[PDB]
């Protein structure tokens, strides 16, 4: 299909941008200490759990403003900063109706270590209705009838601590963008 490689080549693009002159010692450098802890650690598994189970339980926390399950899976400085907006949101009685319509396009972009552990930057396109109400039913943030073409750049840290790898990964920054246009 002319449309799905369009969307393909425009997450072939970010890729691109986020590899400078040092990324693939890095990205070797990151992989090293991953397998040090796990072994038998595969790139195109780990994306695998990206889109079945980390994106999407993260994403719908997100838009939907439940903070006891995003607490679950962030980082602490990075559910601070998410926190603080949702927590201004409920303190006017506000409600979360946004939906996430599709994610695709799921794919690996660069890695490096921080002082949390190793770090794998991954990134994604998704659509998106975003609305929130107030007590009344009216419309105070998003458009109920406007779909959202999303591109999202997100930093998940694994806990070298932790017995299970199916669960040793958490968000620990996300950035992002309108694709309208493109």
Same mark, same amino acid.
């Given at each position: 299909?002319?449309?799905?490689?369009?969307?393909?080549?425009?997450?072939?693009?970010?890729?691109?941008?986020?590899?400078?002159?040092?990324?693939?010692?890095?990205?070797?450098?990151?992989?090293?200490?991953?397998?040090?802890?796990?072994?038998?650690?595969?790139?195109?598994?780990?994306?695998?759990?990206?889109?079945?189970?980390?994106?999407?339980?993260?994403?719908?926390?997100?838009?939907?403003?439940?903070?006891?399950?995003?607490?679950?899976?962030?980082?602490?400085?990075?559910?601070?900063?998410?926190?603080?907006?949702?927590?201004?949101?409920?303190?006017?009685?506000?409600?979360?109706?946004?939906?996430?319509?599709?994610?695709?396009?799921?794919?690996?972009?660069?890695?490096?270590?921080?002082?949390?552990?190793?770090?794998?930057?991954?990134?994604?396109?998704?659509?998106?209705?975003?609305?929130?109400?107030?007590?009344?039913?009216?419309?105070? %943030?998003?458009? /109920?009838?406007?779909?959202? @073409?999303? *591109?999202?750049?997100? =930093?998940?840290?694994?806990? $070298?601590? %932790?017995?299970? /790898?199916?669960?040793?990964? @958490?968000? *620990?920054?996300?950035? =992002?963008?309108?694709?309208? $246009?493109?």
């Amino acid at each position: 299909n002319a449309f799905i490689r369009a969307s393909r080549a425009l997450t072939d693009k970010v890729t691109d941008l986020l590899g400078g002159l040092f990324s693939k010692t890095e990205m070797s450098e990151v992989l090293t200490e991953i397998l040090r802890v796990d072994p038998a650690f595969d790139k195109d598994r780990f994306l695998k759990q990206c889109e079945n189970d980390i994106i999407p339980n993260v994403l719908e926390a997100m838009i939907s403003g439940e903070l006891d399950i995003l607490k679950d899976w962030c980082y602490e400085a990075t559910y601070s900063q998410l926190a603080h907006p949702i927590q201004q949101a409920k303190a006017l009685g506000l409600q979360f109706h946004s939906r996430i319509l599709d994610i695709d396009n799921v794919d690996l972009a660069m890695g490096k270590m921080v002082e949390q552990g190793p770090v794998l930057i991954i990134t994604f396109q998704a659509q998106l209705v975003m609305v929130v109400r107030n007590p009344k039913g009216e419309v105070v %943030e998003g458009d /109920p009838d406007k779909v959202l @073409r999303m *591109l999202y750049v997100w =930093a998940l840290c694994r806990d $070298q601590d %932790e017995l299970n /790898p199916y669960a040793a990964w @958490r968000l *620990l920054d996300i950035s =992002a963008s309108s694709t309208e $246009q493109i």
